[PDB]
Design an enzyme around this catalytic site. Sequence first.
Site, short mmCIF file in Angstrom:
data_model
loop_
_atom_site.label_atom_id
_atom_site.label_comp_id
_atom_site.label_asym_id
_atom_site.label_seq_id
_atom_site.Cartn_x
_atom_site.Cartn_y
_atom_site.Cartn_z
CG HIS A 95 -0.72 -0.42 2.47
ND1 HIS A 95 -0.40 0.38 3.57
CD2 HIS A 95 -0.65 -1.71 2.91
CE1 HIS A 95 -0.13 -0.40 4.59
NE2 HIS A 95 -0.26 -1.65 4.21
CG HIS B 282 3.46 5.71 5.56
ND1 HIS B 282 3.37 5.61 6.92
CD2 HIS B 282 2.30 6.29 5.17
CE1 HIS B 282 2.18 6.09 7.31
NE2 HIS B 282 1.49 6.54 6.25
CG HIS C 194 -0.77 8.41 2.16
ND1 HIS C 194 -1.46 7.24 2.24
CD2 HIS C 194 -0.28 8.64 3.41
CE1 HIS C 194 -1.41 6.78 3.51
NE2 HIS C 194 -0.69 7.60 4.24
CD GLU D 93 -3.87 9.34 3.49
OE1 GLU D 93 -3.44 9.29 4.66
OE2 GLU D 93 -4.47 8.40 2.94
CG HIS E 245 1.02 10.25 7.08
ND1 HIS E 245 -0.04 9.51 6.55
CD2 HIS E 245 0.69 11.58 6.96
CE1 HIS E 245 -0.95 10.39 6.16
NE2 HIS E 245 -0.55 11.63 6.40
CB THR F 246 -5.39 7.69 6.64
OG1 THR F 246 -4.10 7.26 6.17
CG2 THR F 246 -5.33 8.96 7.41
C1 LIG Z 1 -2.28 -1.10 12.95
C2 LIG Z 1 -2.01 -1.79 11.67
C3 LIG Z 1 -0.86 -1.20 11.01
N1 LIG Z 1 -1.18 0.18 10.61
C4 LIG Z 1 -0.46 1.17 11.05
O1 LIG Z 1 0.41 1.01 11.92
C5 LIG Z 1 -0.74 2.55 10.53
C6 LIG Z 1 -1.83 2.82 9.68
C7 LIG Z 1 -2.04 4.10 9.21
C8 LIG Z 1 -1.18 5.15 9.56
S1 LIG Z 1 -1.41 6.75 8.90
N2 LIG Z 1 -1.55 6.59 7.33
O2 LIG Z 1 -2.68 7.20 9.49
O3 LIG Z 1 -0.21 7.50 9.23
C9 LIG Z 1 -0.07 4.88 10.41
C10 LIG Z 1 0.13 3.59 10.91
ZN LIG Z 2 -0.24 7.54 6.22
#
Ligand SMILES: CCCNC(=O)c1ccc(S(N)(=O)=O)cc1
Ligand SMILES: [Zn+2]
EC number: 4.2.1.1
Length: 257
Positions: free
Chosen positions: A61, A91, A93, A103, A116, A195
Amino acid sequence: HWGYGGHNGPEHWHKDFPIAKGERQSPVDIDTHTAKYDPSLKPLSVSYDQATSLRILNNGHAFNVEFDDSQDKAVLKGGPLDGTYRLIQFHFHWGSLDGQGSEHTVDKKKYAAELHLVHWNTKYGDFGKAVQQPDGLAVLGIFLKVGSAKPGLQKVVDVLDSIKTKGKSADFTNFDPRGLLPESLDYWTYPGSLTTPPLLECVTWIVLKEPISVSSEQVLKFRKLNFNGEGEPEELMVDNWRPAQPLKNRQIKASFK
Ligand SMILES: CCCNC(=O)c1ccc(S(N)(=O)=O)cc1
Ligand SMILES: [Zn+2]
Ligand SMILES: CCCNC(=O)c1ccc(S(N)(=O)=O)cc1
């Protein structure tokens, strides 16, 4: 499984992750006319001197630059935050074209990409416990616009050829994330969510007002990554952003007048 394709994108996520329709979802549009300066907010403290990057991973992703978070090395404090938040990964987007990719939006403007920097609250002991708490994470969001190259991004761009497809990783030590930070740390803040699925409502968002500039050639290299695994039909990794969600019963606060 969820994604950003023609049949598994953001408008489908609620079927497996019903919190997608929750009260604290991210990203949001930042209305600069309605966000109020909050003189109680403190300057952000970004302490990345001792950051230890380890690896870069294409997870299907995005790509994540991962850090050693087994001690307080790179930490975020201050701002809207109580306590200490440890950097675990960053990371981006981004879009298929320069006119979309972020985003968060600012007065409905979409930037070409969004960085992010993900941090977790050490009072909860590990990341997996932190994502279960309303104050578990702090994500520092930084907009990217296309213009001059960002020198501190080039090491990331040049490794991307080695992690083209999902599940590939490469060693990525000694990368200094301070080279991704704009001049000013003025910010907006609000309570929100991850997100991507599982969309957990565990994030204090800190979105910097000043974008960084990256070159068209840098972003073009992001867009050569693949969502698919090796040998599978090629699906370029582009448009891996969730659009803005309803603000509901939230206020966006500004750190600056
Ligand atoms: C919990 C399952 C793994 N997911 C993540 O750790 C995670 C998901 C989204 C974002 S974001 N795009 O909101 O920065 C940061 C981290
Ligand atoms: Zn993110
Ligand atoms: C060179 C590796 C990527 N690092 C940076 O670009 C960078 C680091 C620290 C400061 S300072 N100390 O001025 O706040 C400014 C820039």
